[PDB]
Symmetry: D2
Subunit: 261 residues, 4 copies
């Protein structure tokens, strides 16, 4: 079927891509970066994140594969030595697909713009003070004053969420996790402090208090948004599909990345 | 139907219990502490935890209610003023039931003994050094050296899990969360540090290295177990059922207990 | 002697200032905002921080007083009701002075600019990735990748340092404390994680790796500095002097601000 | 002069000790384990901690040396290969001494018993609930409910204090640091949470509320104390003296032990 390959750009990934294309030329596999059914990312987790957002509007018709030319990634969990074994099994097909939940972010103006995140979405202050009211399912939960907030997907919990003290969540759990960035807690201000894990259909809303200008990041893309009235977080109805060929469990991936390999 | 009421023992809870029994005498509600279908706990979360373990073998035939005579609890979320409104709606029936996940703990010897936890189960050292190998689904994940480990239910995440840095999980999520107690991390020893959230059917196993004697707590019951070869944690197939009469969402319960009421 | 008074600008602080000036007119106390020997700050800790930096070049010839018109501050620890008792004892003199350590920050270019901080100095990334080599007394200690670093004075440990997990230090200790902001820790990157407390004459140096542009804050003043080759932190030889009239210990100030008053 | 050597007991340390004694026999150095002026510890930090408490009543007349036969320690910072270079310079003398602060613990009954700690002293509950009132310089600061409290020396901050989130303190600072163990924080109970660093002459007192029985550890020695009315912590007037032969700075020792060597 149709396939494409993204590269980190260095010599190692660029030439691994040209070799896989050549091996794909020995099967009925046509290169198409417009309507691919298989997207192969060669590089790191950042290169994989770029590939996800490249084809975020065809998520249901695409299976993703990650090849790490440097260290082991959580999305790029295939070694370069397995590339030739990869093209053969990609060609035959009959592979299984695994799906991970995604995070939907809605940003309102005084108009709405929505985004999809594979790792997390964060809201941070321009430079001045960051105060936001946190509303959970139309109920005011807290008034946060600090550096920012981070809402993570399950597969994103090993990323930014982890450095903020969040828990690591197995990706079969359809949930999202909110973490704080340097919360002020004294006589006037009071936050929960602990990370929060929300199920499906739960809507977490961030609302401004004085300043209505902040930086909003979705994965690796920080966007300054003006005249923002609301930021809505909920588990997306859409999912990312991975091409599954071997057993590499999430907890073994966590062990290899953080304990030792 | 059949019902019983447990009391914390102080004058306030003891006499609130006698008044509810009297009001129950005005309906076809018989007092039975052997085979009750409704268990009312008057006191605190500790009094509710006692009531759960009193009837842990009839969980599927019982609906629990908690009345807090002191501060607001997470299980005792009914105020004493609503007691007379409680007996009437308890009598008519037609109420809804909500269910929270539980944690199953299996302890092996060189024989097996299993327990059910509503808050958490913890493993801690006698006094000497605590080393355990942590195995996740038959894969060795880490060698923990520290004070202990805590495996929490969703509704237990606001308890011991919270004080150990764990995340707060909505109880509709069928999961368990593992947290560390003062982990040694240097050149020799290495743990994940972050809390871990496991889905159903995932089995977390704790295995001894040198000392085979530790204290194992299940909710409020610390048991010294000897010749222990394994401690197995997984989300239980059993659930606790609450009598639902009004809307008191979990996040509002979290807000009132920790932010301010 | 010579004195001046800064105000937060609201009606409460502005009119408390005019009343203290009037009461000062009944003594041999001349108002001089050029060469004052007594600087009175009416407002909050932010108003006091502004007053410190207003007269940072005459620190050795000035005694500071803070009056909080809102909640209790750590520098503004005098209540408005004590203002008339304040002017009398300010007039007679014979008061004692207490001194708190300060933090010196040196920023080098490819030229040097130095600053004095009463709370802390932080280095953060523009928007892109933040990597800095941390050198302690000319020895490379770690390569930090994350959101930023915070170096706090003793009296600043209850501020930004506290929200980043740092320890609270009694101000009689001539030291500085470094804390991390969301450190990446995996197979490639590795930081100490724990806060670090340095004595006098110890020099902590931050050095760039790729990007040489960051935001550098000194108290409430965030400055974008370009072509930065080094940022040097050490306990300053200069000290801030407070006019001491009553006993308000630091730990009681901590208790009232964070436990409850 | 007079000297002695303690060994961990394994073959490596036992035979390194016999070789150093033989090399010492070639100088005017007499072996005396009753009144030694030089105490050499061969093993780990635990073996060094044992040697400190062996001679805690002659601290002012003794210089300590640590040799690590396993991994690098913070007190045993000499490699076994340097043992022959050690005996020569130990024999000539003319070496310098460095001193680290110690922690004094006083335990009162209804009588007083005092102890000296090189790492830390901790107070923990038997099994039941742990509540203690924390008094700082005769002022009630907080009512702690949790697992326990840890008061660390500067050189102990890389040990138990570190695993509890405490800051790492350079040993030239005459101070002590208090850290919490799993504090309960809700509507009823409230602790500072942050670690606390106290200077000299500051007295931190722990006082019971209901239960008067707890476990009190001083370094590696956990002692169950009954009928305890008070536990008093303050920086000791006594200091431990190390034989200084080379430059191995504390921060390099921290780097090698935790970052990588
Ligand atoms: C410029 C620029 C940004 C580089 C591009 N960058 C791609 C990625 C990634 C990634 N994804 C995962 C994952 N799912 N699980 C585990 N590790 C993961 N990483 C690793 O993450 C490191 C930094 O990139 C790399 O080793 C990479 O293998 C963006 C991602 O960076 C993460 N992030 C941002 N700030 C912080 C912070 N203070 N602390 C921790 N993580 C942070 C945010 O998550 C943001 O989606
Ligand atoms: C003696 C004795 C034990 C008293 C009986 N105790 C009953 C309970 C409870 C409870 N359950 C919940 C819940 N589900 N959510 C939120 N708060 C909850 N609490 C509150 O918890 C406080 C202490 O009891 C009380 O305010 C109570 O309203 C047992 C429970 O105590 C918890 N626990 C034990 N050690 C710690 C610790 N270091 N830090 C934090 N929590 C701890 C363990 O969880 C253990 O299941
Ligand atoms: C716009 C704008 C900034 C407002 C002006 N702001 C003046 C002050 C102050 C102050 N000084 C102390 C002190 N010494 N001890 C204890 N509380 C103290 N505060 C309290 O601090 C709160 C925020 O201002 C107020 O309640 C105030 O009573 C600057 C100071 O803010 C602190 N800071 C900045 N970001 C964070 C953060 N994420 N988390 C925690 N603190 C932070 C940095 O420290 C920076 O010096
Ligand atoms: C049985 C038994 C106890 C073994 C004997 N043990 C001797 C020592 C030591 C030592 N001293 C220092 C130091 N000064 N700096 C840095 N690392 C240091 N260690 C290292 O410490 C590890 C465990 O021993 C070893 O790798 C050792 O090289 C006692 C010391 O253990 C420390 N401790 C106790 N519980 C915890 C805990 N939950 N987390 C962290 N540390 C803990 C308490 O501190 C108590 O003084």
């Amino acid at each position: 079927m149709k396939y494409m390959i993204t590269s980190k750009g260095d010599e190692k990934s660029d030439l691994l891509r040209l070799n896989m294309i050549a091996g794909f030329g020995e099967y009925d596999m046509e290169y198409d970066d417009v309507e691919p059914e298989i997207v192969i990312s060669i590089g790191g987790d950042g290169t994989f994140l770029s590939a996800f957002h490249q084809y975020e509007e065809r998520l249901d018709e695409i299976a993703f594969i990650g090849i790490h030319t440097g260290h082991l990634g959580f999305y790029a969990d295939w070694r370069p030595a397995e590339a030739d074994k990869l093209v053969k099994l990609l060609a035959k097909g009959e592979y299984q697909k695994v799906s991970y939940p995604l995070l939907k972010t809605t940003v309102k103006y005084g108009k709405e713009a929505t985004y999809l995140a594979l790792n997390e979405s964060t809201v941070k202050s321009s430079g001045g003070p960051f105060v936001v009211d946190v509303v959970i399912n139309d109920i005011h939960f807290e008034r946060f004053r600090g550096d920012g907030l981070c809402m993570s997907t399950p597969s994103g919990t090993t990323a930014y969420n982890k450095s903020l003290g969040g828990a690591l969540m197995h990706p079969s759990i359809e949930a999202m996790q909110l973490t704080e960035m340097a919360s002020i807690n004294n006589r006037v201000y009071r936050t929960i402090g602990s990370p929060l894990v929300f199920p499906k259909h739960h809507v977490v809303s961030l609302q401004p208090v004085n300043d209505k200008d902040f930086q909003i990041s979705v994965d690796h893309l920080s966007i300054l948004h003006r005249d923002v009235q609301e930021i809505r977080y909920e588990v997306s109805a859409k999912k990312i599909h991975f091409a599954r060929f071997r057993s590499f469990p999430f907890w073994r991936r966590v062990h290899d990345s953080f304990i030792e390999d």
